[PDB]
Design a binder for this molecule. Structure first.
Ligand SMILES: [Zn+2]
Ligand SMILES: [Zn+2]
Ligand SMILES: [Zn+2]
Ligand SMILES: [Zn+2]
Length: 155
């Protein structure tokens, strides 16, 4: 194998929500941890979770696993399953009521135009012209509104 790997890739954070049903501590707790790379999350979620090739009955209990904690007929079967628990992406969708995510930059940029011309979150400040997708940004654009400007009438 070989690749250009020009420059540095994208730094994405991962999380393995492991909710043990046999846990005697409530409310049900999840596996608190993080990783800088996928591989690191694999060796863990697999060994640090599903265990190694030594464990016979291996079962992955996800905070909301689609399997509901079911056993497989092979190791590769389980290890391959957790593959869905990763779902690593470069950048989500700038739309709130979309929660959509893509693995391509052109896909998102092209999919963002298929949403609408105007933004959902518009500056609440009257006589102001802005655009936002998250109530956070807007509320952050107010830090500059606290004050006013006296000069150009038509603004
Ligand atoms: Zn974990
Ligand atoms: Zn699972
Ligand atoms: Zn979208
Ligand atoms: Zn404004």
């Amino acid at each position: 194998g070989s690749s250009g790997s020009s420059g540095q890739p994208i730094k994405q954070e991962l999380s393995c929500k492991w909710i043990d049903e046999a846990q005697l501590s409530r409310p049900k707790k999840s596996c608190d941890r993080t990783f800088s790379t996928m591989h690191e999350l694999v060796t863990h979620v697999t060994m640090e979770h599903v265990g190694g090739p030594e464990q016979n009955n291996h079962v992955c209990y996800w905070e909301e696993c689609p399997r509901e904690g079911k056993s497989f007929k092979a190791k590769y079967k389980l290890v391959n399953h957790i593959r869905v628990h990763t779902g690593e992406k470069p950048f989500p969708c700038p739309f709130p009521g979309c929660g959509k995510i893509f693995a391509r930059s052109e896909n998102l940029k092209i999919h963002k135009r298929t949403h609408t011309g105007e933004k959902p979150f518009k500056c609440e400040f009257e006589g102001c012209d802005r655009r936002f997708a998250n109530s956070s940004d807007r509320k952050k654009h107010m830090h500059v509104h606290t004050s006013d400007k006296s000069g150009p009438s038509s603004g």
